[PDB]
Amino acid sequence: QVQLVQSGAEVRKPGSSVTISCKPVGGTFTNFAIHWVRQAPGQGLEWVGGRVPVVGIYKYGKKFHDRLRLYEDDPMKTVFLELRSLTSDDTGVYYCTRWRGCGMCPYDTSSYYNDASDVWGPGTKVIVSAASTKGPSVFPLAPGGTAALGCLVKDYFPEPVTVSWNSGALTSGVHTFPAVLQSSGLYSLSSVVTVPSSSLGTQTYICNVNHKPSNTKVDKKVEPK
């Protein structure tokens, strides 16, 4: 039934602007308002604004007034969000949402704005970074009878990287942390493994790092000092 399709991820230099597209599939186009909700990494849901297409009833969030424009293309039945003067606080996932309501409303010609959102788009990832595609550099993390070693996969762009240990043969005690975006605009994560301290002189520990946007496949040997 009523379903919302959103455009793919976008990367924008700081200070510039980005435009997302949301296309409803099913139902009507001018009855129910499209409300945009965004989420910054590790933060709560934030309402950006809402607009009934064509009809012209719209409101912007106080934080996004003077920076936000919501509009539509009536021929293509597509709504757009434009945010200007992007900063690091604008990095996040942007969802277009609406209320299903009467769905395929027949002869309604009525406008509804204040409703909950039970229909969500997949979300559009917006990354505010002045960085270009860059492969990662891999640094070792050298170490009650248990020790820890790992790999620091640093300064790559964009997401994601895949990390395994011993071609994937070592999986017990492995923690690959979520990548953090540092102030330089590049991503960085670590992957760790806990082993018995007796195994340090014995076992070999190799982490396999994959970054497909850069076509990087790299093996690093982690040795104790």
């Binding site: 909700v37 309402w47 809402g50 550099s137 070792p140 050298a142 923690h175 960085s188 670590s190």
Partner: protein, 214 residues
């Protein structure tokens, strides 16, 4: 104009346990403008409740909403693996919508103290112009833990970043990594690098450290 607050920050539940989430409004509002949303760790948000008490289509009897005036509650019974996640209340009356800060509902288990490790900068990284010191907090519960970097006993701020793993499905613990970012020039001036860890499972703050070189 209307601010929504939720309590608690984190809610820990056993299998059969029943928990209650609170949504506190800044002023007296009508129950017709309150919704509840569920956010799984890797999914788009889902609507659970509209108009304070109206259950959305396809939402089981497990979730019920109540409230009046300024205090609204969501009650969860027979919590199931799908249900663990972040819960947000929303006000959608008037012109400007607002969300609550959210409450994470995780799996309850016995408190377990973290194992703390500190990792010196690799020699490969030093000849690159930057230096990263990594501190690892392994398999702890509950989720919240504080990490403070002390370079020659001088507290740091703004030059560290940390991230946490999702709660393990097996043993229901958390893991944390903190990276302190230093320029090579700054790294050479100082001698003491320490990681101060504060957690409920530790009787007193645990500190792991090393000295540049040895």
């Amino acid at each position: 104009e209307i601010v929504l607050t939720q309590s608690p920050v984190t809610l820990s539940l056993s299998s059969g346990e029943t928990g209650t989430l609170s949504c506190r409004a800044s002023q007296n509002i009508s129950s017709s403008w309150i919704a509840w949303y569920q956010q799984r760790r890797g999914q788009v948000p889902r609507l659970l409740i509209s108009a304070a008490s109206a259950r959305a289509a396809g939402i089981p009897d497990r979730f019920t909403g109540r409230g009046s005036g300024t205090d609204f509650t969501l009650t969860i019974t027979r919590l199931e693996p799908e249900d663990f996640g972040v819960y947000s209340c929303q006000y959608y009356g008037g012109s400007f919508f607002t969300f609550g800060p959210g409450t994470q509902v995780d799996v309850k288990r016995t408190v377990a103290a973290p194992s703390v490790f500190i990792f010196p900068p690799s020699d490969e990284q030093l000849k690159s112009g930057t230096a990263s010191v990594v501190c690892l907090l392994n398999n702890f519960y509950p989720r919240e833990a504080k990490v403070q970097w002390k370079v020659d006993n001088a507290l740091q701020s703004g030059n560290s970043q940390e991230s946490v793993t999702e709660q393990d499905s097996k043993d229901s613990t958390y893991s944390l990594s903190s990276t302190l970012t230093l320029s090579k020039a700054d790294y050479e001036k100082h001698k003491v690098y320490a990681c101060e860890v504060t957690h409920q499972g530790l009787s007193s703050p645990v500190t792991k450290s090393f000295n540049r070189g040895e």
